């Protein structure tokens, strides 16, 4: 028996949910995670400059009780991966330890530790609607932070009839939302089809039958053709939710980060899609004191993002990780400067955020029911992300993977209030 703690990341969390699958032979059976367990598994993050923390941190709220339970623990995940011989040398008292491969922990979690460098079904290890499919790891993307590059291996992704058939099953055992994981999801294809089979992808998964979400993260700007834009804008089952990172927002930081295209053939193309559908949500990430940024470079990204208007945004301080080709970078900038702008930036879109979330008052958008809590009722609406972005509360009745039409009333704290229409 054993029990999986998830954490990191969807990617992270996908391969749990397919691993958990796995050990249903080896494994005879998985212990609801009630702490009740035989053998332990913790999947870690490695690279986020936090998860980082939240990982080991997390390791200990299971080592600190370990002679509480008795459970062989293990530390699985990326965190282990690039950090085997500092973790091991610190943290002894672990029986085991992995980081990438799924084909082991079948004839290797059941003892012995790894890390050197087919179809399988899947089991959800809690009461969700939603699941995430991985179509694809690694990235062979310019990317000069990133040192997945290799890290986590080359750029392998899955064929349309796998994804196909995994997303199918899902769908019958009671799924509501799909949702499409990986490094880059602009670079599916690629490495199989000899060409970006994003779009073909979509429009297949567009085709099954039965009403459901299907959401795509981790677009890469460089590469998000708009083959791809008129794709997840023409499918009527494709959330129009585009999670593009752009990391920056200066034509002299970009050229540096390894991007092709710059601040303003960006904004050509976020804008773009927001006047084929002005309630489109653009979600993107940021990194402040990026090796060679200077006081214009932060001013020229401001007013990048209160120019643009994303409707989700997050910040996060440079961490150059050793082999990156940032890190060789010259001359950085005091982690307390860039502090400084990862908080004011933050401030900044704080109010965008509102602004963006003031004009779907009055609207109805889909809703997806996920909890009853009394009359009351949790879920999400095809804008919000799982546990990433915000929540929103309904007053009405319902069962948790239901689609309602709510209409939103009031907000803020990046919550929204809302009752549903249309009623029996």
């Given at each position: ?20 699958g ?13 702490k ?17 923390r ?21 530390v ?20 085991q ?55 986590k ?47 073909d ?11 459901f ?69 653009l ?11 200077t ?19 997050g ?40 602004s963006?979330?003031?004009?779907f008052?009055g ?62």
């Amino acid at each position: 028996r054993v029990g999986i703690k998830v954490l990191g990341c969807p990617k992270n969390e996908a391969d749990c949910e397919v691993l958990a699958g796995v050990l249903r032979e080896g494994g005879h059976e998985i212990v609801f995670d009630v702490k009740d367990a035989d053998v332990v598994v913790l999947d870690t993050c490695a690279f986020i400059e936090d998860a980082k923390r939240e990982s080991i941190d997390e390791i200990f709220s299971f080592v600190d009780a370990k002679d509480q339970y008795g459970y062989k623990l293990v530390v699985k995940g990326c965190l282990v991966q690039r950090y085997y011989e500092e973790l091991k040398k610190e943290i002894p008292e672990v029986d085991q330890w992995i980081g990438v491969a799924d084909p082991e922990e079948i004839a290797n979690a059941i003892e012995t530790d790894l890390v050197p460098d087919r179809y399988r079904k899947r089991i959800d290890l809690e009461e969700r609607p939603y699941a995430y499919v991985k179509i694809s790891d690694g990235c062979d993307r310019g990317c000069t932070f990133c040192s997945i590059p290799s890290f986590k291996g080359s750029l392998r992704s899955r064929s349309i009839e796998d994804i196909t058939r995994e997303v199918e099953d899902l769908l019958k055992e009671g799924k509501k939302e799909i949702i499409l994981v990986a490094q880059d999801t602009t670079s599916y294809g690629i490495d199989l089809y000899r060409k970006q089979a994003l779009p073909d992808l979509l429009r297949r998964l567009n085709s099954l039958n039965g009403e459901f979400w299907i959401r795509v993260m981790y677009l890469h700007p460089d590469h998000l053709t708009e083959e791809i834009i008129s794709a997840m804008l023409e499918l009527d089952k494709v959330v129009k939710y585009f999670d593009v990172p752009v990391q920056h927002g200066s034509d002299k930081i970009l050229k540096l980060m390894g991007r092709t295209k710059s601040s303003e053939e960006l904004k050509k193309m976020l804008s773009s899609i927001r006047e084929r559908f002005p309630d489109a949500v653009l979600r993107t990430s940021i990194i402040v004191g990026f090796p060679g940024e200077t006081e214009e470079d932060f001013e020229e990204l401001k007013q990048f993002v209160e120019e643009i208007q994303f409707d989700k945004l997050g910040a996060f301080v440079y961490s150059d990780e050793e082999g990156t080709v940032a890190f060789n970078l010259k001359e950085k900038v005091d982690p307390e400067m860039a502090k400084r702008r990862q908080e004011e930036l933050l401030l900044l879109q704080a109010e965008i955020s509102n602004s963006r979330l003031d004009r779907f008052v009055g609207k109805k958008l889909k809703f997806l029911v996920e909890g009853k809590e009394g009359k009351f009722l949790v879920g999400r609406t095809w804008t919000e992300a799982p546990e990433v972005d915000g929540v929103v509360f309904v007053r009405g009745k319902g069962k948790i993977g239901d689609f309602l039409e709510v209409v939103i009333k009031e907000h803020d704290e990046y919550d929204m209030w809302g009752s549903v229409i249309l009623e029996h």
